[PDB]
Write an enzyme that holds these catalytic residues in place. Structure first.
Site, PDB file in Angstrom:
ATOM      1  N   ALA A 187       0.828  -1.201   0.000  1.00  0.00           N
ATOM      2  CA  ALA A 187       0.000   0.000   0.000  1.00  0.00           C
ATOM      3  C   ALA A 187       0.863   1.252   0.000  1.00  0.00           C
ATOM      4  CB  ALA A 187      -0.942  -0.005   1.205  1.00  0.00           C
ATOM      5  N   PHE A 188       2.028   1.188   0.644  1.00  0.00           N
ATOM      6  CA  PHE A 188       3.041   2.227   0.552  1.00  0.00           C
ATOM      7  C   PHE A 188       4.409   1.561   0.521  1.00  0.00           C
ATOM      8  CE2 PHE A 188       5.193   2.325   4.641  1.00  0.00           C
ATOM      9  CZ  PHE A 188       4.332   1.611   5.442  1.00  0.00           C
ATOM     10  N   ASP A 215      -8.364  -0.242   5.740  1.00  0.00           N
ATOM     11  CA  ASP A 215      -8.032  -0.480   4.338  1.00  0.00           C
ATOM     12  C   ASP A 215      -8.044  -1.980   4.051  1.00  0.00           C
ATOM     13  OD1 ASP A 215      -7.421   0.382   1.742  1.00  0.00           O
ATOM     14  OD2 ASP A 215      -5.261   0.167   2.085  1.00  0.00           O
TER      15      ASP A 215
END
Ligand SMILES: CCCn1/c(=N/C(=O)c2cccc(C(N)=O)c2)[nH]c2ccccc21
Length: 294
Positions: free
Chosen positions: A20-21, A130
């Protein structure tokens, strides 16, 4: 409760993908595979810190284990998930794996088990915010699921009150779990037909749009799924309830420990005429259910 790590002890092997990052790449460390996450741009530093402090508190079989974190180039050192992401198993590699109703239910149970642990955290409950197949990893031949990416695209799994700007609680994860349940049963991307930019999905969901219903889906599963989709967060079940319900249902879904080993050419027909066909087969569930109730 970490364990400081020295980058020189890592020795990278090769990049496996982006989370996600940041970036993830396989590596070795003390005679065992490892996944390390580094921040490309310093804008990702905040996400790096929150995930660092949160993952240091979690200890659950269905959450990725954090070994340590090095600050020389600033990176997290976690366990390597050989099976990749659930999203890849569902919609990814060219030779897609066959999986059964038991796998789908088992995956969703393990996910609720992990989230229930997060929601039970003291002093304050930990909200993932998320939850989606891209952030769910698989190991043990695709049999064990583990949640990752605690840093907090995702609009198709987001509860309306979240992108509504309104205050939200742990029930936003329950909405996401419900979408995931529909997704593994159908092996369809939620709201793929809508497409376009994100705001087009947000509008649909905000007006009450939900994924189409599933032909021949058992009513006990349909009830749980649609309850998780409730507009009103207070009408959604808690994760503790989902775990209990899913645990009881697994009695009728034997074979979840069978590894994924067979390929298939998932056709995926365009037949969204109100109802939709499931990918998995519930024939055995109905048979085993009738045995108990008779
Ligand atoms: C997005 C998935 C990337 N990927 C992968 N991830 C991980 O092992 C992992 C482990 C811990 C945390 C994270 C994360 N994101 O915080 C990730 N293992 C893979 C093996 C084959 C192909 C792709 C792979």
């Amino acid at each position: 409760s970490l364990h400081m790590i020295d980058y020189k002890e890592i020795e990278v092997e090769e990049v496996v993908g982006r989370g996600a990052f940041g970036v993830v790449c396989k590596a070795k460390w003390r005679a065992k595979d490892v996944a390390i996450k580094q921040i490309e741009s310093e804008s990702e530093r905040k996400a790096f810190i929150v995930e660092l402090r949160q993952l240091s508190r979690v200890n659950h079989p269905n959450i990725v284990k954090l070994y340590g974190a090095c600050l020389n180039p600033v990176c997290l050192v976690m366990e390597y998930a050989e099976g990749g992401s659930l999203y890849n198993v569902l919609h990814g590699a060219e030779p897609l794996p066959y999986y059964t109703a038991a796998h789908a239910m088992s995956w969703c149970l393990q996910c609720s088990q992990g989230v229930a642990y997060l929601h039970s955290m003291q002093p304050k409950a930990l909200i993932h915010r998320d939850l989606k197949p891209p952030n769910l990893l698989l190991v043990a031949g695709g049999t064990v699921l583990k949640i990752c990416d605690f840093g907090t695209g995702s609009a198709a799994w987001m509860a309306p009150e979240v992108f509504e700007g309104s205050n939200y609680s742990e029930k936003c994860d329950v909405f996401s779990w419900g979408i995931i349940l529909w997704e593994v049963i159908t092996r369809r991307k939620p709201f793929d037909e809508i497409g376009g930019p994100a705001f087009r999905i947000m509008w649909a969901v905000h007006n009450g749009t939900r994924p189409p219903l599933i032909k021949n889906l058992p009513k006990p599963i349909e009830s749980l799924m649609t309850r998780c989709w409730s507009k009103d967060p207070s009408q959604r079940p808690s994760m503790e309830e989902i775990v209990k319900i899913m645990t009881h249902l697994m009695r009728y879904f034997p074979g979840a420990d069978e590894p994924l080993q067979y390929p298939c050419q998932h056709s995926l027909p365009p037949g969204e005429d109100g109802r939709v066909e499931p990918y998995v087969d519930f024939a055995e569930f109905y048979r085993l259910w009738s045995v108990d109730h008779g």
